[PDB]
Ligand binder design. Structure first.
Ligand SMILES: Cc1c(CN2CCN(C(=O)C3CCCC3)[C@@H](C)C2)cc(F)cc1NC(=O)c1cccc(C#N)c1
Length: 255
């Protein structure tokens, strides 16, 4: 790629992201005074572990589905073979969702948007995975310290997804070339806006992987203790991507 095509790639990624956000950033910031009362928080904490897991699993499936659309809209992704399309989504989808969580994070009061209002991490105590919750909140705290623009989150999450080191890629070189162009795009936009300082502050790739594997771990614990719940009440896309016990992704991609 030459320079003018890199700048074209920057706009293409920013637009693909814009069209595939679960909510506009405005909508998330207009709601910041809308906070769960002490009684609604006690309601969340008195809920059973399995109902809370189901409501979070449902919420994650919606977020993941917008990430699939982002991938379908992302320049060059549909050109990869279906096997690498699925390998990339299987590994990266939760990661992009983890990065995207910071838009719904309010670092003043340390609350997150969840089912219509903002609450702190004590909302999720019924999950019984307080370590993972703390890590997500801290991760989201770190990303918010960097004051990402929407364009930056667009470019960063594109690289989070288009990772040519994912085990199982059949056209590894074709993914590396796409990855290189997106990296060029990202770094060009950072340079043009005088934001290269954030390069040293981005989370290591082992942190995003750590959060994901912890998600799979705590969920496998939960599913062991409640196997019918996951079978009966968890969204199919969520079970495919994560549980012990490629086809919904297949159809999401075909459509
Ligand atoms: C809810 C939320 C948490 C809390 N966290 C606990 C449960 N979860 C798990 O993974 C649990 C850990 C293992 C199983 C479930 C996450 C889903 C969420 C942190 C955070 F930083 C942001 C959010 N909310 C959003 O990001 C959000 C919500 C609605 C719309 C949009 C948009 N656009 C974004």
């Amino acid at each position: 790629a030459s320079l003018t095509e890199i700048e074209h790639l920057v706009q293409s990624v920013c637009k693909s992201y814009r069209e595939t956000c679960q909510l506009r950033l405005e909508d998330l910031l207009r709601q910041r005074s809308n906070i769960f009362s002490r009684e609604e928080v006690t309601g969340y904490q008195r809920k059973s572990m399995w109902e809370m897991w189901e409501r979070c699993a449902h919420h994650l499936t919606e977020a993941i589905q917008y990430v699939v659309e982002f991938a379908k809209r992302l320049s060059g992704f549909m050109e990869l073979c279906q096997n690498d399309q699925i390998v990339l989504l299987k590994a990266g989808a939760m990661e992009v969702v983890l990065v995207r969580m910071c838009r719904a994070y309010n670092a003043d009061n340390r609350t997150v948007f969840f089912e219509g209002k903002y609450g702190g991490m004590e909302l999720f105590r019924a999950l019984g995975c307080s370590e993972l919750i703390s890590s997500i909140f801290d991760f989201s705290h770190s990303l918010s310290a960097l004051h990402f623009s929407e364009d930056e989150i667009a470019l960063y999450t594109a690289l989070v997804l288009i990772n040519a080191h994912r085990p199982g890629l059949q056209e590894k070189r074709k993914v590396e070339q796409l990855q290189y162009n997106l990296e060029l795009a990202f770094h060009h936009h950072l340079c043009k806006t005088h934001r290269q300082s954030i390069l040293a502050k981005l989370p290591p790739k082992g942190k995003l992987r750590s959060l994901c594997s912890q998600h799979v771990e705590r969920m496998q614990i939960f599913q062991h203790l409640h196997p019918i719940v996951v079978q009966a009440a968890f969204p199919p896309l969520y079970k495919e991507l994560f549980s012990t016990g490629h086809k919904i992704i297949h159809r999401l991609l075909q459509e």
